Design an enzyme around this catalytic site. Structure first.
Site, PDB file in Angstrom:
ATOM      1  CG  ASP A 115      -2.150  -0.822   1.051  1.00  0.00           C
ATOM      2  OD1 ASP A 115      -2.447  -1.291  -0.061  1.00  0.00           O
ATOM      3  OD2 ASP A 115      -2.831  -1.039   2.065  1.00  0.00           O
ATOM      4  CD  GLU A 160      -4.142   2.474  -2.129  1.00  0.00           C
ATOM      5  OE1 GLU A 160      -3.943   1.488  -1.379  1.00  0.00           O
ATOM      6  OE2 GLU A 160      -4.671   2.339  -3.247  1.00  0.00           O
ATOM      7  CG  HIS A 199      -6.983   0.276   1.561  1.00  0.00           C
ATOM      8  ND1 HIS A 199      -6.888   0.047   0.206  1.00  0.00           N
ATOM      9  CD2 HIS A 199      -8.276   0.625   1.794  1.00  0.00           C
ATOM     10  CE1 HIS A 199      -8.064   0.252  -0.359  1.00  0.00           C
ATOM     11  NE2 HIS A 199      -8.926   0.589   0.582  1.00  0.00           N
ATOM     12  CE1 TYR A 233      -5.091  -6.085   4.132  1.00  0.00           C
ATOM     13  CE2 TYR A 233      -4.424  -4.059   3.032  1.00  0.00           C
ATOM     14  CZ  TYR A 233      -5.096  -5.275   3.018  1.00  0.00           C
ATOM     15  OH  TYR A 233      -5.760  -5.708   1.894  1.00  0.00           O
ATOM     16  CD  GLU A 284      -3.940   0.417  -6.840  1.00  0.00           C
ATOM     17  OE1 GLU A 284      -4.592   0.736  -5.824  1.00  0.00           O
ATOM     18  OE2 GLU A 284      -3.809   1.175  -7.821  1.00  0.00           O
ATOM     19  CD  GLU A 321      -6.197  -1.545  -3.635  1.00  0.00           C
ATOM     20  OE1 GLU A 321      -5.260  -1.497  -4.452  1.00  0.00           O
ATOM     21  OE2 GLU A 321      -6.533  -0.563  -2.942  1.00  0.00           O
ATOM     22  CG  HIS A 368      -7.977   2.114  -6.063  1.00  0.00           C
ATOM     23  ND1 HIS A 368      -7.413   1.829  -4.841  1.00  0.00           N
ATOM     24  CD2 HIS A 368      -8.962   3.017  -5.825  1.00  0.00           C
ATOM     25  CE1 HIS A 368      -8.022   2.531  -3.900  1.00  0.00           C
ATOM     26  NE2 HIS A 368      -8.976   3.254  -4.472  1.00  0.00           N
TER      27      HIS A 368
HETATM   28 FE   LIG Z   1      -5.436   0.731  -4.303  1.00  0.00          FE
END
Ligand SMILES: [Fe+3]
Ligand SMILES: [Fe+3]
Ligand SMILES: [Mg+2]
Ligand SMILES: [Mg+2]
Lengths: 286, 286
Positions: free
Chosen positions: A74, A105, A108, A112, A168, A202, A205
């Site tokens: 990311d 991002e 994200h 994680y 991605e 994603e 994206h």
């Molecule tokens: Fe992405």
């Protein structure tokens, strides 16, 4: 020429003026992104620990490593957006999309890292996972590949947008499929729910990459795109069968390889080209 | 010497690794930004038109010109964040803040443009307002001032952060007060509600600026900051008493002048300096 001939890349003296909208397709992608905004705090993790402790040790090993890989990748995607894409593209509509992608991002990445912190209490293990680009041989091939594209001073935006759609869309596909495999087994609701949000994001994206590619006047050749895509599939297939094998969670390595190729074909088509591998999707849950 | 001495600006190889958080104060402001996310779609404008039509023509002139000023200024703030602040600051926590600020500025610009489109149907008037930087002398002074700080190759981050705190804190303060005056008068709930959201955000963006300034080792002198802030004050005072007089909506031009000074004093204090003007807040509704 080449750039003054490119509407996406040429001088726009109205770049920081928002209205009126001229590129409605690009703009609706931004509105789609904006309408699906979510935060890490919305994901309920309170039932994951019990499930995590019941897993086999090698399952925890695989999952912690997929998490570390996602968190690290990311930042590379983010780096590219911040330093390159959001700078070079001049149309307002894409600038809005890329600004919101950067924000997502970060979310994200946080998600994680929260997952890592929740499952793994040992501070040495956390640090090992957070610094995966340096500590983890498996992610190195992917990480270095993506990073080369950021520092490549000669490759066109057309080539680089393809490369990051491969990041991605291809580099993430095996790991997304793995988490979805775990959902089939009814394990870790927090992980699997967050996985749905992130893979949706994603996918959007990569959809946006293809839309940008379509608006380019001077696209790279099919042959050129083919060699970026195949190269990426090979790296991904190796990641999933050698470096961090999917049998660690009960998956068929051979079907996983086929799935990566299904994914790359779908991306090739979405980019306005022809399939490369001509295989079906082995996974009904994808 | 020059900048490897500045924790905010020096090389950070963990720049794109999110965890662990080390600047908790900086991170908490980002979480605060993130928790107050909103979109233009959430603001109901359907009950404003009747009020809009009830106003004197010079009130409609005033409001549409304020709206056009805000839309244009947002893009300059945005340009600065995209090209400078988000690039040059190296701590992860601030990069997350600035990335989210960019997204919110885009939502701000959209809100202002939607207000324009909703109140003003004439296509020629809309284009005149959207091109306020080229078309409206009243905004020129402010636009050029802010734009100079983006182009300034030699001013320090410390100077520039202050300059943009003056942009979001001083250049916006009179207009925000104007809209709050309209709220007092019971007019246009959509405008005034959106104005609550945006001034709050802008307030936060200024707080963040002061937080960064505080974390600098090589701050500019109190004298030098006074110079920037006093300059900004006079530009804003000219804007609201001469170029677009607040008289046009029933406000007292002398009390408004005093309000700007009070705002500047508060900013100077927030930056760890002393008051300049030592005047009270004339407005009970601020
Ligand atoms: Fe992405
Ligand atoms: Fe702001
Ligand atoms: Mg534009
Ligand atoms: Mg970091």
């Amino acid at each position: 020429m080449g750039v003054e001939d490119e509407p996406l890349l040429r001088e726009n003296p109205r770049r920081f003026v928002i209205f009126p909208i001229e590129y409605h397709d690009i703009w609706q992608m931004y509105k789609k992104a904006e309408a699906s905004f979510w935060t890490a705090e919305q994901v309920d993790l309170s039932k994951d620990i019990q499930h995590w402790e019941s897993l086999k040790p090698e399952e925890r090993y695989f999952i912690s490593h997929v998490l570390a890989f996602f968190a690290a990748s990311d930042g590379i995607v983010n780096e590219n957006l911040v330093e390159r894409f959001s700078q070079e593209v001049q149309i307002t509509e894409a600038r809005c999309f890329y600004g919101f992608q950067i924000a997502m991002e970060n979310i994200h990445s946080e998600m994680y890292s929260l997952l890592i912190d929740t499952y793994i209490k040992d501070p040495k293990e956390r640090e090992f996972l957070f610094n995966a680009i340096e500590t983890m041989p498996c992610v190195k091939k992917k990480a270095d590949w993506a990073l080369r594209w950021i520092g490549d001073k000669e490759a066109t935006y057309g080539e680089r947008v393809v490369a990051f759609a491969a990041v991605e869309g291809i580099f993430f596909s095996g790991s997304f499929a793995s988490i979805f495999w775990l959902k089939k087994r009814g394990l870790m609701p927090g992980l699997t729910f967050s996985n749905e949000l992130i893979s949706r994001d994603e996918g959007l994206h990569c959809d946006f990459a293809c839309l940008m590619f379509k608006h380019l006047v001077h696209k790279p050749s099919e042959e050129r795109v083919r060699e970026i895509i195949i190269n990426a599939v090979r790296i991904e297939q190796e990641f999933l069968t050698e470096a961090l094998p999917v049998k660690l969670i009960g998956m068929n390595c051979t079907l996983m390889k086929q799935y990566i190729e299904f994914v790359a074909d779908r991306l090739m088509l979405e980019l306005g080209f022809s399939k490369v591998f001509r295989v079906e999707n082995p996974f009904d849950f994808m």
